[PDB]
Ligand binder design. Structure first.
Ligand code: NI
Ligand code: NI
Ligand code: NI
Ligand code: NI
Ligand code: NI
Ligand code: NI
Ligand code: NI
Length: 163
């Protein structure tokens, strides 16, 4: 059993939230490949657990060919989802940082958290990451700064995972 596999801790944590923000940068996108596959499998066969309803995926990429296989995986998943009546389950943004649209540059995280927040009031959002320690700081800060103690407040819970 792998942490990034169907019965791994990371996969279980991801499935415990109604909505999640998954961020994978560079080689850090690799674990998410197995996680996305397992989540799609569970969604189609796991009657006993129906918690996860929405995935916001962020891919920070420098070399587009090095992980060409990951892009194909995203299209594959996206296709299967549109098929079995579930397009909208996954929304992904790809950022080419070398210098479902693909953008050049890095995201404005403050803007991203606000948008997601406004779309899911009174929701506990799990935030996950596999990438540079700095990006972890940013996500942590944003997660806290964008959460609200109010009744309709949104909660961004950054989950540490041992990839
Ligand atoms: Ni194992
Ligand atoms: Ni496993
Ligand atoms: Ni378990
Ligand atoms: Ni090659
Ligand atoms: Ni350069
Ligand atoms: Ni709700
Ligand atoms: Ni609350």
């Amino acid at each position: 059993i792998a942490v990034d596999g169907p019965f791994g801790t990371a996969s279980e944590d991801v499935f415990s939230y109604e909505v999640v923000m998954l961020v994978g940068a560079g080689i850090g996108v690799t674990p998410f490949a197995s996680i996305l596959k397992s989540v799609w499998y569970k969604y189609c066969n796991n009657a006993t657990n129906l918690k996860l309803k929405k995935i916001y995926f962020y891919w920070l990429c420098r070399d587009t060919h090095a992980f060409e296989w990951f892009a194909d995986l995203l299209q594959l998943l996206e296709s299967q989802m549109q098929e079995r009546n579930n397009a909208g389950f996954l929304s992904y943004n790809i950022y080419l940082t070398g210098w479902q649209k693909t953008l050049y540059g890095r995201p404005n995280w403050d803007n991203e958290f606000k948008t997601i927040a406004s779309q899911h009031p009174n929701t506990r959002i799990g935030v996950f990451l596999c990438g540079p320690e700095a990006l972890a700081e940013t996500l942590s800060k944003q997660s806290i700064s964008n959460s609200e103690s109010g009744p309709r407040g949104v909660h961004f819970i950054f989950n540490k995972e041992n990839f």
